[PDB]
Amino acid sequence: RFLKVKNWETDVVLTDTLHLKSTLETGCTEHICMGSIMLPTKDQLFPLAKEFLDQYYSSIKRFGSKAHMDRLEEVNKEIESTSTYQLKDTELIYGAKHAWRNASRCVGRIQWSKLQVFDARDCTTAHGMFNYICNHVKYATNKGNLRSAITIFPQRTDGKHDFRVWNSQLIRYAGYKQPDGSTLGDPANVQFTEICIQQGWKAPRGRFDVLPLLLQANGNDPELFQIPPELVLEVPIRHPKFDWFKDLGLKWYGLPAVSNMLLEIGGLEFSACPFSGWYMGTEIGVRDYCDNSRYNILEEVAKKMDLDMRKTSSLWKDQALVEINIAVLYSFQSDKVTIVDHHSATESFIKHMENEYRCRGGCPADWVWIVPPMSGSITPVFHQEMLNYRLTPSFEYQPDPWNTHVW
Amino acid sequence: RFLKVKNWETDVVLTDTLHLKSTLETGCTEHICMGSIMLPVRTKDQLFPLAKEFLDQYYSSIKRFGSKAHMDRLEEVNKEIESTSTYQLKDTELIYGAKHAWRNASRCVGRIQWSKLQVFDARDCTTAHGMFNYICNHVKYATNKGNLRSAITIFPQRTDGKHDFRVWNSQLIRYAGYKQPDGSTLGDPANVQFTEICIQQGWKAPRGRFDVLPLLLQANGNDPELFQIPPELVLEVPIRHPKFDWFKDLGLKWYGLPAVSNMLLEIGGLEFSACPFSGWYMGTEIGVRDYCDNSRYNILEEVAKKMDLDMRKTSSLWKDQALVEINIAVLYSFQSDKVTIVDHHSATESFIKHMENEYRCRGGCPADWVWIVPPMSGSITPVFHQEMLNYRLTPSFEYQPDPWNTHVWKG
Ligand code: HEM
Ligand code: HEM
Ligand SMILES: Cc1cc(N)nc(CCc2cc(CCCN)cc(CCc3cc(C)cc(N)n3)c2)c1
Ligand SMILES: Cc1cc(N)nc(CCc2cc(CCCN)cc(CCc3cc(C)cc(N)n3)c2)c1
Ligand SMILES: [Cl-]
Ligand SMILES: [Cl-]
Ligand SMILES: [Cl-]
Ligand SMILES: [Cl-]
Ligand SMILES: [Zn+2]
Ligand SMILES: [Zn+2]
Ligand SMILES: [Zn+2]
Missing domain, CATH: 3.90.440.10 (Nitric Oxide Synthase;Heme Domain;Chain A domain 2)
Incomplete structure (x- = not known):
């Protein structure tokens, strides 16, 4: 209701008022935190439409204006008549940018306003x-x-199309x-x-x-x-020091582009809305390459560096992990394909979050996802308390x- | 109600019932998750239920629920509360209580060990x-x-909160x-x-x-x-590195005994405000946190200078490189001097086995992911991909x- 977040490294305390505008539900209750679970009608539509339009017209500083009222009327009329409604281009561009702005699991959000939106309606x-x-x-x-870009195909209608x-x-x-x-x-x-x-x-x-x-x-x-x-x-993966690294035959693609999520703006559901940015290096070197259920190459790299793999306490896994990640970043940089490392990416997010607190009164963030999957406590997000809540427009x-x- | 958790690496699904015995509060509401927030005088009235529920747990665990001994203990504790406003725990209840607070500590990766805890009664x-x-x-x-x-020393409980x-x-x-x-x-x-x-x-x-x-x-x-x-x-252990001979010349050392002395042990409604407890270190506590936090000894730069890493850009991952070597050094030093220490790979593997065992035997294992996952190499440890449920059971550390x-x- 007026919440504080502390950074334990710097002692900065920030106050969140934005969560008051929280709409969807979190999964958590007063008895049980679900923070680490990956997935925890005309009547319904007009409220959702109104709430979005109100935030749109306030953002362009014409809340309560005739143009605000007139649009609300027109959308109301259109829903009564057709049981749906059509977003204006400006409303669409605003909503897609805000869906990203609101993405609590996204470290890359400093960039949110520079999204290129392709209307494929x-x-x-x-x-x-x-x-x-x-x-x-x-x-x-x-x-x-x-x-950054998103392409937005037609909205859901009767659910059968x-x-x-x-x-x-x-x-x-x-x-x-x-x-x-x-x-x-x-x-x-x-x-x-x-x-x-x-x-x-x-x-x-x-x-x-x-x-x-x-x-x-x-x-x-x-x-x-x-x-x-x-x-x-695509980028072939080589290491700046280890000659043999290239002989693993590893490569990855440059464009990360999520294509299976649903974009909800003002009650409307865009079920095909692929979006892309650029990779943070750990996404490939840690997740794609090293997860046991993915390409799972830790053992091979370790073997080639000739580390003592007899016992976990030599940190041979940790050594091979840093080297794979060095290779990923080096390979992207040498080919001039945009990539960001986790230090730089998390530093940027901390600056973003500070801006968002100052100018918006908050920044929903999901700590579990924001903290990189390697070297967590040496990045500035590790010590940053965060509040996770759901704002709309949203990716679901x-x-x-x-x-x-x-x- | 049943709650399922999934492991994303193995696809194993477990079912939690234990959460139904949850009492205290999480900080979270249906509108806000506070999973990453660090920090989330009793009357007779409140006390007897808390006593009753504790003693029911105790008597169940010893297979004596509903016994004459169980009923007499309830009546005994009851009178003692109405007559003196509080009550005294039997030694066996204190031991059982202290082990349970540890068993219930959802931020503790070390809990496979919970049943081997030396309790010193200092009441x-x-x-x-x-x-x-x-x-x-x-x-x-x-x-x-x-x-x-492992050990805990339990001093006298709170009375009027003025003593x-x-x-x-x-x-x-x-x-x-x-x-x-x-x-x-x-x-x-x-x-x-x-x-x-x-x-x-x-x-x-x-x-x-x-x-x-x-x-x-x-x-x-x-x-x-x-x-x-x-x-x-x-x-104490002086810190040296198995390959780097200049590492010793950093002047580092650490103490072998991690011993938390500022927490409160709640058992059966009673409050033990001095109850220091200790185990042994996971290496990352010293090497990642105590050495490499910026607001601590902050040695990353100096170590990286000595390895002569490219420090001109974060994208050389020089920080990650110094971090691994520092942590290799901590583990090597403790092992060489024969002082108990556990690496994060070993400790997390143990915790996952503990946790599955707890689900089968107990119906749950409350766990706080933010804390359980190590502060380096998170995802190549088996806890990263494990969904957990965080809830509060008593007895507890507060x-x-x-x-x-x-x-x-x-x-
Ligand atoms: C500028 C480049 C970008 C970077 C570096 C970036 C970074 C990330 C990272 C690291 C994750 C988590 C993946 C992980 O756990 O490793 C993430 C998740 C997410 N990002 Fe961003 N991002 C970027 C652009 C975008 C754009 C353009 C959108 C939408 C327009 C977006 C929306 C999301 C969403 C919805 C998730 C969570 C997906 C889920 O819940 O499964 N990202 N992003
Ligand atoms: C046996 C060796 C043990 C190991 C390796 C171990 C490991 C850990 C680790 C890694 C943490 C998180 C600290 C951090 O990295 O920030 C932790 C927290 C905790 N542990 Fe264990 N532990 C052990 C024994 C115990 C014992 C004997 C107790 C009490 C009986 C205990 C109760 C807790 C509590 C209450 C916390 C949370 C502290 C807080 O909330 O600030 N631990 N332990
Ligand atoms: C637009 C965009 C840009 C970017 N750089 N990165 C993304 C990542 C989206 C994404 C996609 C997947 C597909 C499945 C595996 N490759 C997975 C993830 C993260 C998955 C994840 C799982 C778990 C269990 C924890 C955690 N923190 N993160 C994130 C999106
Ligand atoms: C009995 C016991 C054994 C053991 N090995 N480790 C412990 C944990 C001790 C501990 C001590 C402190 C004091 C500062 C460290 N020198 C702090 C913590 C919690 C640290 C922490 C902070 C933050 C901000 C996040 C996070 N995930 N973990 C935990 C207890
Ligand atoms: Cl990916
Ligand atoms: Cl993952
Ligand atoms: Cl410590
Ligand atoms: Cl810390
Ligand atoms: Zn993964
Ligand atoms: Zn929560
Ligand atoms: Zn720290």
Whole structure:
């Protein structure tokens, strides 16, 4: 109701008033904190619409103006008549930027206002979706000098005509289970890869096979498309000191682009709204490369550095982990593909959070996600108390469509 | 109601029922999570239920629930409360209580060990001098020449809140910090304020980088008193690195015995405001936190200078490199001197096995992810990918305000 957050490294105390405008629910109760769980009608719509428009018109400093009232009237009339309503371009651009501004798990938010928004509300077919996505990918990649972007397909209507991108990211590598029993490629993508082969994809059956897009337009059955290979910028991974590192045959793609979330603005639901920024290095070197359920390369790198792997207390895992991460950052930098390291990224977020407290009265942040997955306490976010709550406009999770889709 | 937690690395799903026995509050509401906030006189009326529920837990655990002995103990405690406003725990209840507070401590990665806790009952203690003696015996027993043993010493419980026993130190063993006129700090900056108090109370400070603090001890609500732990009872480890011969020349060392002395033990409604407890270190506590926090010894720069890392840009990951070597050094030093220490890989693996075992046997294991996950190498430890549920069970360890803010000076 008037909350304080302390930074334990610096002693700075900040006060949060923004949480009073909190809308959705957290998962937590007074008896039980769910902070570390990954996923914890016309009547309904007008309140949601009003609340959003009120925040839109106050942001442009015309709250209570005729233009404010007139728009509220017009949206109200349109909902009564058509049971939905259409956002103005300005309202759409504002809402998408704020969905990012509100993303409590995103360390990269200092950038929130520089999002490029592509309005794909005129799209009608999976083929249109594919053209729109290719242009997004190329615009955002920008020869390695990456730029934030989102592409917004038509909103949900009766729930039977959803646009969806079936892929979880625009760019990801396939996964195949072997006769052997091991996994070839990225183990995270095995089920989706099976859906693609099931739908006709000719799988190359390599380690780093860029998956086809599977696109669903207007609630129709999804269709398959291959992104032009020349549009998928990749980086081979080398180490600035270890000659042998390149012989692991490792590479990653430059563009991180989340494609399976739902964007809710003023009550309306944009179920296909892929968005991309650029990588923080640990995302690849720690998660993609080192998670036991991902490419899982810690053991091989350690073996090549010739460390004493007999006992955990030599910190051989920790040594190999730092080196993999050095290689990731070095490789992206040498090829001039935008990347940020966790020190720089978290320092930036702390400056952002201070701005947001000063100018907005708050910044919802989820500590579990904001603190990098290596070297936590040496980054400034570790010691920063944070309050996690849900503001709207927002990005939300939604079920994988192959569980939902009547074929 | 059943609550499921998932592990994202293995896909194992567990079901929590234990949360149904949750009593205290989390700080969280349906609108706000306070999972990353550090900090979240009893009448007869409130006391009997709290006593009753504790004694029911105790009697269940010994398979005597509903026995004549159980019922007599309830009646006995009941009368004692209405007649004297409080009650005294049997020794077995105190032991069981103290083990449970640890079992229930959701920020503790070390809990696989909870059932091996040496409890020293110091409820007959009446003076600060008595406290000193009890604490020296704790330290010597727990140190055991490097082969560390868990232990807790329990002084008399709160009565009217005007007669509290308190250990004013935050740990039994910690190093002084001295703020200098030039703004710099000598020793441990975490302990500057407490060092000022000790000096104000009459301690002659050596003013070095690693001076062991005196104990400042309050018995029966009296003004506290200073005592020097016998130097021969303070086990220390000089820090060296297995490959880098210049590391020793940094002048680093640390004490072997981690001993938390400022918490409150609640059992069956009763409040034990002095209850120092100790185990052994996980290496990261010294190497990541005590050495590398900026508001602590802050050695990252100096170590990286010596390794001659590229310090011109954070993206060389020079900080991460110095951090690993420092932590390698801490573990190597303790092992070489035969003083118990655990690395974070080993400790988190143990905790995950503990936790699964707790789910099967107990129906839950409350855990605080923010604290359980280590401050380096988070995700290559098996706790990172483990969903946890955080809730509060009694008996428990609780925070209490520092006694210098609340103490009524007798003079
Ligand atoms: C500027 C480049 C960006 C960087 C460096 C960045 C950084 C991150 C990181 C590190 C995570 C957590 C992943 C992890 O745990 O390792 C994250 C999550 C997230 N980011 Fe950002 N981000 C950026 C751009 C964006 C943009 C443009 C949006 C939306 C427009 C966005 C919205 C989110 C959302 C919704 C999540 C959480 C996804 C989930 O809950 O699963 N990010 N981002
Ligand atoms: C046996 C060796 C032990 C190890 C390795 C161990 C490990 C830890 C670690 C790593 C933390 C978090 C400290 C940090 O890194 O910030 C912790 C916190 C805690 N531990 Fe354990 N522990 C051990 C024994 C015990 C014992 C014997 C007790 C009490 C009987 C205990 C109760 C707690 C409590 C109450 C906290 C939270 C402190 C706070 O909230 O500030 N620990 N322990
Ligand atoms: C727009 C954008 C930019 C950027 N740099 N990074 C992102 C990351 C989004 C993302 C995607 C995934 C897909 C699955 C694995 N690659 C995963 C994550 C983080 C997952 C995660 C899991 C768990 C269990 C904890 C935690 N802190 N984070 C985050 C998005
Ligand atoms: C009995 C016992 C054994 C053991 N190995 N470790 C402990 C924990 C002691 C402890 C001591 C302090 C005082 C300062 C350290 N020198 C602080 C803490 C909590 C540290 C902490 C702070 C913050 C801000 C976040 C976080 N995750 N952890 C924990 C207790
Ligand atoms: Cl990724
Ligand atoms: Cl992950
Ligand atoms: Cl410590
Ligand atoms: Cl800390
Ligand atoms: Zn992971
Ligand atoms: Zn919570
Ligand atoms: Zn710290």
